[PDB]
């Protein structure tokens with residue numbers, strides 16, 4: 001289909017215009033890091049020449065924005081880790097990429113080490129630890145670096161996350177007080193606060209990165225116990241019978257302190273960020289890292305269930321849309337050689353032309369919610385060799401069974 005080409009071309013036009021006119025532009029979420037990945041993934045196509053040029057332009061632009069306004073964050077989705085991920089594949093092509101990457105890496109270590117030092121536990125909020133803004137996301141990038149000089153950093157973060165699964169105010173740790181919720185409306189959903197149970201912002205994300213850390217060579221008894229405790233909490237608060245393979249977004253103090261779910265949710269959905277699809281990654285990675293066939297078998301059922309149901313799905317975006325679910329299924333097939341999701345993947349690719357044309361102008365061009373995320377997904381069905389590490393940003397680990 002020649003429609004990816006037209007669409008890409010118009011994304012380049014918008015970004016060529018912007019790159020001679022905002023914090024947002026430098027983020028993986030909505031900005032150039034995402035556009036760089038999308039374009040870099042299209043190398044086999046005829047216009048890779050032009051694409052590498054735009055990529056190099058957009059990198060130029062990024063470094064002069066950094067060397068003027070600096071960086072405030074090391075985060076995967078808003079900061080240095082996402083900028084570094086978007087160009088990691090380019091490292092050995094020229095020293096300009098290597099130098100820039102080394103700068104990003106020193107900044108990250110500085111930033112992480114500084115964030116851990118100043119951390120106040122009874123002010124814990126998801127951007128502290130999570131995938132989008134916190135350490136889990138940062139570690140996801142760092143584990144791609146083999147240079148042994150980041151070992152202490154890796155374990156510093158691993159211990160820190162593990163420690164957050166310990167009991168506190170009686171029992172607690174990763175529990176978020178109501179005033180510590182990310183948004184006004186969330187403070188109001190959870191007047192007594194909660195344990196966030198999503199991949200993007202909650203316990204599943206922390207669990208995944210610890211399983212992935214283990215298989216990359218980075219674990220101890222404390223982290224393996226943390227992983228275990230997390231999967232144990234997922235096994236415990238799983239909803240029942242007809243709501244089987246479902247979890248609420250958050251568990252509240254008393255639910256936790258009585259070990260049974262009490263009040264029922266208003267809105268559960270099937271997303272990468274919250275719900276079954278994301279949660280299946282925890283079971284998959286726990287299962288594989290812990291050598292537990294039950295966990296692995298179950299991850300499959302959790303995802304299979306979500307694909308059948310598509311709860312709250314009304315777009316093709318990555319974060320909480322159908323492209324997200326589809327990409328998680330593609331990972332299962334890569335790691336397990338399962339055929340369980342083959343019809344869902346087939347159907348999506350059959351429908352591709354329509355997906356792009358009806359994609360809103362409304363959610364922008366960016367990775368996490370915009371059309372370029374969707375183009376990444378489509379592009380790797382068409383040509384499955386990944387030139388980039390984009391999937392790392394979603395905790396989709398193609399190297400999970402490659403060793404250390």
Ligand SMILES: [Zn+2]
Nearest residue numbers: 271273319320
């Ligand atoms: Zn989302």
